[PDB]
Symmetry: C4
């Protein structure tokens, strides 16, 4: 059971938004607010401990691996590894990014998931600005930034960021990113595309804050992000950091070649080749 | 004249749902409630007697033979063999099961029929669960189970099942299933696909009951089903079991090669080949 | 200027519906009611006199010659030959009759015309009955019958028919039907297809009358129709029968090969060939 | 930030509509009303001085160069050369003018732009008249006329025209129209197509005035237009005519070959070739 709609009440407008950078391991838990929902993205479940607990308000996955991630999320839920209230596909509704067939058939395959573009399109000014920069300049926001936009569109007012490290330093992930299954799905480093940049993520985040009037804090003392956004105040909060049981799902799940999966992958192949 | 909409009133929420297994011949009529509507599916009219009377609230047919079954149902009605209030196509809205063109043109060809998926999609949790199991695991519910889901979505509260025998024993149909017309339409046994299973039907039925809070009884004392669902109480009800007149329609009707039928079959061929 | 919507008021529910049979020349004008709207179809303007006056409430044209007839109607209007309040394309929304592209682009080309199927689809029982007979039996109603269905759907209550002669006798049209332009558009008799029949038109008309509870009269004393529907009562009405000026449009207009007409005819060719 | 909707209030219904003819240089500023919005089209920014000031209520661009003009307009705005409240694509929704894919994907690429046809389609009589003349007679209104129709549909009541000179005389543009970028985008005179005409523009403008009851004035004393529409009264208004800074954008901007631009141009090529 997912939520039918993600509704933010006026009484709790705090959101923690986590990337999967090394600083996920170095959160200052004293700086978390008393109440909050959590957003995670992509390979968050690769984490060896529950760095932000077991309750995820929404997870966010990219269209190119959505089939596998949707199944992985359903297994995380069934195996009681996490509680996941909503599942988004991080989308822009641009036909050189998401194929017509992918968008058309999305809800047919994933009836309880949500296309992210349907939420961020409501941020009119920000949405036009990201499309203009994508189309004409080949600049794209990362999932951390996307999740912020989604949070703002859904009516959260204070964002606390962590695991956002702009792919700098020698540790680039708090885990092995080139796991066996990642290698299989996309045959042969796992580094960001040229369309992504620290400067652009930062500009986009500053724009979200200036247009929509929300507050953005950092949580990780020793992270690059904290040089650009203020660390949240140490309010002496405590946290119980729990380990993952040993046979936790720790790699993206593969799918069996059923008639439906084969149909899906056939189509996805055909138009990923075109794009 | 079909009904425009199937509306269940609070005063009568009982539904009898019949498969076409051998136990259709062995209903304990004393266990039927006083009031009820009846759902039948597929080759129900192959029956040699009116095992559940002449008044069918809805019939349900699979997309692959819908053209012939729609015509057969219109002839059953015109020949006064049955009264049929509604006609559904048992559908899931998955493009590896029902082609885009089939779904797109459905109401164009069959303006007074109803696509079943438009009704079961409202059972959000159950609908997501059947799609997940279909796509990733190649498990599909049988029409008996589908009809239960439809009944629950339309607001029936108590289901009595019969003719559901999970394809076990040596009698598999209370009639000849490989009739001349069945053989012609689909050129050469008539046994269920590997995607269907007793275990899955049962799990899906138990899930419908636990999510939507309805009651499911059996009607056939000597049937496998009764080992999994309680027999309905013997309330001493009586039934007049009527024979079919001799020249009853007893096989699926064939269609003439008109411009419309040829157009339809041409298209259906083209994309059944793709799927 | 066409009407945006054809709205029938309770105070005037009379409609005269004219085919283009020989009996158009033999209307008994004494039998017309005091008040009425008029529907005409196809090559009505071939008439040498204004047999039903100059004011047409709606005209009805077949999809296969709609482009030329739309232009002809606009010229009839511009040249003050008739006043035409509405223009329909007599359609069923069946893809072996009207191509997907024709229906999709209809309003793009003809923004002030109306697709007839959008009106008759509201006659649920009658619409299902004509589709069933078209698809499975290759029986189609003629435009006279279609116009009756449209009238009934729009809320007219009494129909007076004329120019309906079921293609019987030696005079089949009160004019030359194989005119020069008819010959050109559709290169080489102008007789009805096998899908049309007197028996079916009559059955369909009797059905419209029994389902929707309206009255259908004849106006032509010496016509076949009057053997099946009652002649309207001689109420001593009078009529001024006016001649057409000599240079009246008397043949369907041809179109120039503009970029738009060529585009249109290219597409129409491509999928008339498929159908 | 564009406006979400262009809303005309009852208190200000005046619009200045400028073509890019030589008479843009010869506006009689004494004849402008006290209050007004301004519409400009196409290569307006080629102007060497701010002939109508810096505040544009809407700009209008043709589909065939929309990609470049949209980017040019965003740069005019970012560089503070103009303030542009709305951006329209001058469209008719005819598939031989605008491809299906162009219209389908329009808002995907340009989320804050507006398709003009969605506004002028509400002028029912005028819209049917321009489509009839386009399709059957290959007559098309120019952007000046289109902008008038848009203004009337949005509820402006008095139009003042300038820069409309029907491509007559020896000066045809108050600037070089065959600039380097114009030459590149559309490889090798810049004169109007045969579908455009002074007579038709004038007839269409007179029709807008007679159907929708608005007033149309001229502003340029020595222009052809003033022989067909009355010059606005000299009310002794004054105007500060400002020069453009030297490094003003003065040619249409070219786009970089990003994945999105290449995708877009690939598609546009494919179906401009078909049309
Ligand atoms: C190879 C490839 O495709 N790498 C991309 C990567 O360029 C980036 F597009 C992103 O991010 P991904 O690395 O998974 O990590 C999630 C988020 O954590 C933050 N982060 C992470 C590590 C780090 N050192 N500094 C950081 O700031 C970023 O804000 C990022 O959005 C993404 O969606 O933005 O997704 C991955 C994959 O497409 C994805 O993992 C498939 O499931
Ligand atoms: C060859 C083939 O395609 N067999 C399938 C069969 O695997 C099964 F998919 C089903 O069922 P079908 O056998 O017609 O019978 C209808 C229902 O009766 C119940 N039943 C029947 C016999 C039995 N011994 N034990 C039972 O439990 C099942 O719940 C079933 O759903 C179906 O839609 O579920 O449909 C048929 C045909 O596609 C259909 O007849 C075409 O018109
Ligand atoms: C060759 C061809 O295609 N003939 C068909 C004809 O079979 C018939 F389909 C019809 O009728 P069409 O003859 O024009 O005449 C209009 C109506 O007048 C009535 N009538 C006419 C003559 C007659 N002797 N007895 C009659 O009853 C019929 O009710 C008919 O519907 C039609 O749409 O029903 O349309 C024409 C053409 O497709 C059309 O003219 C193209 O513009
Ligand atoms: C080569 C080509 O395609 N020329 C066309 C031209 O035939 C005409 F279609 C138009 O007009 P364009 O010349 O740009 O000028 C804008 C408007 O100013 C008015 N005017 C201009 C000059 C003049 N001497 N007398 C005038 O009356 C007209 O009302 C016109 O609508 C148009 O959209 O109507 O657009 C251009 C281009 O397609 C456009 O510039 C691409 O960005
Ligand atoms: Cl996989
Ligand atoms: Cl058949
Ligand atoms: Cl022609
Ligand atoms: Cl370019």
């Amino acid at each position: 059971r997912m939520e039918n709609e993600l509704i933010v009440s006026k009484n709790m407008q705090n959101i923690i938004i986590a990337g999967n950078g090394p600083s996920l391991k170095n959160i200052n838990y004293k700086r978390l607010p008393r109440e909050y929902d959590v957003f995670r993205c992509n390979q968050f479940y690769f984490e060896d401990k529950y760095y932000l607990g077991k309750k995820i308000k929404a997870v966010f996955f990219n269209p190119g691996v959505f089939l596998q991630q949707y199944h992985t999320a359903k297994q995380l839920i069934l195996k009681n590894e996490y509680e996941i209230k909503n599942i988004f596909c991080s989308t822009f509704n641009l036909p050189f990014i998401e194929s017509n067939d992918f968008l058309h058939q999305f809800y047919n395959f994933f009836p309880d998931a949500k296309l992210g573009y349907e939420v961020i399109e409501n941020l009119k000014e920000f949405y036009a600005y990201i499309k203009y920069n994508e189309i004409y300049f080949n600049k794209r926001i990362t999932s951390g930034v996307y999740m912020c936009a989604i949070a703002i569109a859904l009516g959260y007012k204070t964002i606390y960021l962590c695991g956002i490290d702009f792919y700098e330093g020698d540790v680039i992930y708090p885990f092995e990113a080139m796991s066996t299954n990642i290698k299989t799905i996309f045959p042969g480093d796992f580094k960001p595309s040229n369309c992504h940049s620290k400067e652009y993520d930062i500009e986009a985040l500053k724009l979200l804050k200036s247009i929509y009037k929300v507050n953005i804090y950092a949580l990780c003392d020793d992270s690059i992000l904290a040089n650009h956004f203020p660390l949240s105040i140490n309010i002496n909060n405590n946290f119980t950091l729990e380990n993952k049981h040993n046979n936790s799902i720790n790699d993206i799940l593969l799918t069996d070649n059923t008639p439906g999966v084969s149909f899906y992958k056939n189509q996805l192949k055909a138009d990923n080749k075109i794009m």
